[PDB]
Every structure is written in structure tokens, then in C-alpha cells.
């Protein structure tokens, strides 16, 4: 599906500040702190559009923020912030209308690896089985990178 309502040629970053080895009390503090930092510099990171997304993996969960980035450079700054300041392994970045998703490994002070995932970030039909990693949005719709 082509989400033509979304403004074209912008980048969405799904980013969390959680860890699987920490108290959820601490994780929530980290998440609030990260959201503050992103909002504090909208010129650098872009506009935070939603803070009420849940992630998943395989089943653990975490709060995730969607940041709308106006350009690829902003998206890298968000990715760098997660990987360097919040010890994240990667962030999910997908295009505006095509939702062509990829994992960005911005680890390190300079340079970055971007791995394009095969397929597009799309809603998983209700009743279909979830496999591996998926994301639930603020409306309870389930999203996954589908090949």
C-alpha cells in the first residue's frame, strides 16, 4: 500500500530508549528523557509525531517514538543519538509514502552502516499471525517489515 496522505520525501525514525537488562522504572525515565532531548532540538532531530507506540521482538515490549525527519541528515542525527547516547543497536527508518524500510547502524562517532530491509513497512492484517519483530502504533494497528 502507498500511503499517499503522508508528505512525500520525508523520513520516519522509530526509536526507543529501552533495554532488556534494566528495571522498567528506569526505562521509563530514559524514555521520557530521550523524548525531551528530541523535542529540545527540533532543527536537528525533526518533529516528534507520536510517543505512544509499542515495539516487540522474539515476547518483550518497549515504548517507541516515531520522529518525522525532513531529510536524511536529520535521520542520521536521530540514529546517532540512539546508538551513542542510549546504547541502541539500531533504529528503524522508512520512507514517507512507499514505506521502504531499513535498519541504520549509526554506531560510532563518525560513519554509519545502513542495511536496507527487503520489503516495506506495512500494516499486518488483523487475525494474521505475527512473526518475530513487529510494532504496534498508538491506534493498536500492528506493523511489520513485510517482504
Amino acid at each position: 500500500m502507498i500511503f499517499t496522505k503522508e508528505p512525500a520525501n520525508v523520513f520516519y525514525v522509530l526509536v526507543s530508549a529501552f533495554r532488556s537488562n534494566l528495571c522498567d522504572e528506569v526505562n521509563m525515565s530514559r524514555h521520557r528523557h530521550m523524548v525531551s532531548t528530541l523535542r529540545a532540538a527540533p532543527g536537528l532531530y525533526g518533529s516528534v509525531e507520536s510517543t505512544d507506540l509499542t515495539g516487540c521482538y522474539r515476547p518483550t515490549e518497549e515504548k517507541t517514538v516515531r520522529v518525522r525527519c525532513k531529510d536524511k541528515a536529520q535521520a542520521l542525527n536521530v540514529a546517532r543519538l540512539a546508538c551513542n547516547e542510549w546504547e541502541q543497536d539500531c533504529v528503524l527508518v522508512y520512507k514517507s509514502q512507499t514505506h521502504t524500510a531499513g535498519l541504520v547502524y549509526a554506531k560510532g562517532i563518525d560513519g554509519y552502516k545502513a542495511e536496507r530491509l527487503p520489503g516495506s513497512f506495512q500494516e499486518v492484517p488483523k487475525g494474521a499471525p505475527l512473526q518475530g519483530c513487529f510494532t504496534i502504533d498508538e491506534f493498536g494497528r500492528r506493523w511489520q517489515v513485510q517482504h
Binding site: M1, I2, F3, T4, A8, N9, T98, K126, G127
Partner: protein
């Protein structure tokens, strides 16, 4: 299974769209005073004249010349250098006005005329519309937006677009050709026009990943385009029906929309067919759905209802036809009642397509949940 598909669109300055807007501007003016009016307006636009004709059954009083000049002036034709002037053009009126008359069931009114209506909806896009026609409308709509707000003051109202999409196994993988013919002033040179149009119109609209090096751009392929609009070519109401509805992606019944009141099934039933087609796809019953409704003049119930899912249906096809008859009242007055079409909202629908814009009564997916429960898909 790669195959190229092409769709095109025209701007509001195109002569065939000036007639559509003028016809619907007259319709909206009448509906403000007499919502139950009967309007069938046909507009012919020539180099220096606008001929407005048709038959009206209403008690409303409208100034056709004032409406026509205001409509053309809002488009942006203000002096003869553009090829057409709103303040100094002949506006002939051939409208034949009558007087409305004065106990049976209103929903049992027969269709005022026979015809075929097609509704289409696909889960290809977010707004449940074919992709090529949506982006074709975006380019011309962006051209008018850029021209009016002053980003490119040397643009002029007339513009045409044409985008060729490259499908692969039913999914778009890129854009193969973009054509954007625009009318400009003699001030701007040809080379600078192509750079500005490419950077300011094509780039902000089309996704960057689709525009590869193999994409071919044709921006004013002929040359200078200074004098256009009505002078360049004649314009008539209903000559751009395909670019209005879906482009070439879906079949069309052949009935024009602009200048017709909702009481005529040539317009309301097409909106209704799109309404039921969008709800079926929105309910998850089918990935693509096409609805055909046929009326006989003087008969209330449709003579035939056809649902086509192209083998993408989650329920048996004969069950879908029962659901359409069960939920949606397709009698000619039932369409108005279930869509609330008796409002002056048709001036906006005659510019960049009657479908795909969610602020329209027929673009609401409210019965989608009911249909899904009725089909028992949980």
C-alpha cells in the same frame, strides 16, 4: 510481469476544466437557494466567449455572468496576454429556467434518465484509489499551488501532466516517464523553466526512490507555451471524465458529472457506486472491487447490480451481491438520503478529481465495519 501503465491529469486552467468549474459554480449557486432544484448545465468555452446552457427547474435567481466571470477570475485569467480575460469575455446564457411543481413515497421516485455507472476502489493506495491517477493529480495541483502562492510568478493557469508508472507483479517499482506541460509567460526562458519546474514541482511531489536515472522527463517538449487556455483549444463540459474518476485504471459508464444536480443518477449513482466500492475494500472483503449500477428511466430499482473482485475476494462473489443489496439503498432517492448530497459542495469537486479526497460525503468508510460483521469475517 512488468508492464508500464500511464495516467494523465490537467490543471484547473485547462479549457475542458474551465467549463467543468463554470458548470459546477452555477450548480453550487443554485443549490444554496433551492437545494431540491434540478440542474443540467452545459458550458462551451471558446477563444473569447463562454456559452452557458442547459435546463433548470428551480425557483432560485442567479446571475450567470457574474458567476462565470468570478470563476474564471479565480482561476487566474485576468488579461488578454494569457489568451483569455475574465473581465472582457462574452458570457452568453442559453439557460432555460422553469417552475417547480408540487404525495407518494419519496424513495420510490424512478430514475430521471437511464445510464451506466461504475465505481472502483483498490487497496493499492491509502485513499483506496489507483496510484497513477493520484500522482497525476498531485503534479497539476502542485503547479496551481506554486503559481498562486507566488513561488513561481511566471507560471500561467493552463497545465497538463502525465506519469507513466512501471508495475511489477502488481506492485509499483518506479516511474518510467514524467510529462509536465505548463503555460508560462514570455519573460522566462525555456532552459530556466525546465530547471525550475523540475526542482519545484516534480521533486517535491514524486517519491525520490521511484525517480531513477532511467526515468525520462518531458517538460514542455515542444517549446514555448505562452498563449494557452481557451484560445489554444475549445472546452466543453464533460470532456475530461476519465481524468476525473480514475484515469485508465477503471471502466467508466460515460456519464459526465459537472453541471448535474444530485437528483440525476448520472452523477449521484457514480458517487454511490464509489461509496459501496470503497466500503467493500475498506471492510477487507476484497483487494479490488468494481461496482456497476444500471438504471432505467422511470424505474426506481436498478436494472442490474454487478460486483467484480478480479478474483481477490475473501467471500464468495454471489454473497457479496447480496450484501450490497442488503445494506446500500440504491434507489435514486436512496442515494441522496444515504450520502447527503443536497449541499453546495460541488465547486471543489470539479478541479482535481471527484474521488480520493476524504472531505467528501462519498469518501467516508462508515459502513465498512457493518459489512465485515455481516460477512462474518470477525
Amino acid at each position: 510481469a512488468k508492464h508500464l501503465f500511464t495516467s494523465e491529469s490537467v490543471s484547473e486552467g485547462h479549457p475542458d476544466k474551465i467549463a467543468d468549474q463554470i458548470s459546477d459554480a452555477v450548480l453550487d449557486a443554485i443549490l444554496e437557494q433551492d437545494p431540491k432544484a434540478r440542474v443540467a448545465c452545459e458550458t462551451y468555452v471558446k477563444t473569447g466567449m463562454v456559452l452557458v446552457g442547459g435546463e433548470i427547474t428551480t425557483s432560485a435567481w442567479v446571475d450567470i455572468e457574474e458567476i462565470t466571470r468570478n470563476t474564471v477570475r479565480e482561476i487566474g485569467y485576468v488579461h488578454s496576454d494569457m489568451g483569455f480575460d475574465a473581465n472582457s469575455c462574452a458570457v452568453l446564457s442559453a439557460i432555460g429556467k422553469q417552475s417547480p411543481d408540487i404525495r407518494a413515497d419519496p424513495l420510490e421516485q424512478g430514475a430521471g434518465d437511464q445510464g451506466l455507472m461504475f465505481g472502483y476502489a483498490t487497496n493499492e493506495t491509502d485513499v483506496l484509489m489507483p496510484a497513477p491517477i493520484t500522482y497525476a493529480h498531485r503534479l497539476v495541483q502542485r503547479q496551481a499551488e506554486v503559481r498562486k502562492n507566488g513561488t513561481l510568478p511566471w507560471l500561467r493557469p493552463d497545465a497538463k501532466s502525465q506519469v507513466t508508472f512501471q508495475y511489477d507483479d502488481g506492485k509499483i517499482v518506479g516511474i518510467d516517464a514524467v510529462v509536465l506541460s505548463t503555460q508560462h509567460s514570455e519573460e522566462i526562458d525555456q532552459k530556466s523553466l525546465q530547471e525550475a519546474v523540475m526542482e519545484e514541482i516534480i521533486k517535491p511531489i514524486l517519491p525520490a526512490e521511484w525517480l531513477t536515472s532511467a526515468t525520462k522527463f518531458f517538460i514542455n517538449p515542444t517549446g514555448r507555451f505562452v498563449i494557452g487556455g481557451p484560445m489554444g483549444d475549445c472546452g466543453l463540459t464533460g470532456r475530461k471524465i476519465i481524468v476525473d474518476t480514475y484515469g485508465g485504471m477503471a471502466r467508466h459508464g460515460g456519464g459526465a458529472f459537472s453541471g448535474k444536480d444530485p437528483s440525476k443518477v448520472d452523477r449521484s449513482a457514480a458517487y454511490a457506486a464509489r461509496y459501496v466500492a470503497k466500503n467493500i475494500v475498506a471492510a477487507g472483503l476484497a483487494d479490488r472491487c468494481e461496482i456497476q449500477v444500471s438504471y432505467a428511466i422511470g424505474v426506481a430499482e436498478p436494472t442490474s447490480i454487478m460486483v467484480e473482485t478480479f478474483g481477490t475476494e475473501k467471500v464468495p462473489s454471489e454473497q457479496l451481491t447480496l450484501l450490497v443489496r442488503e445494506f446500500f439503498d440504491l434507489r435514486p432517492y436512496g442515494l441522496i438520503q444515504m450520502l447527503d448530497l443536497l449541499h453546495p459542495i460541488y465547486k471543489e469537486t470539479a478541479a482535481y478529481g471527484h474521488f480520493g479526497r476524504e472531505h467528501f460525503p462519498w469518501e467516508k468508510t462508515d459502513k465498512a465495519q457493518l459489512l465485515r460483521d455481516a460477512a462474518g469475517l470477525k
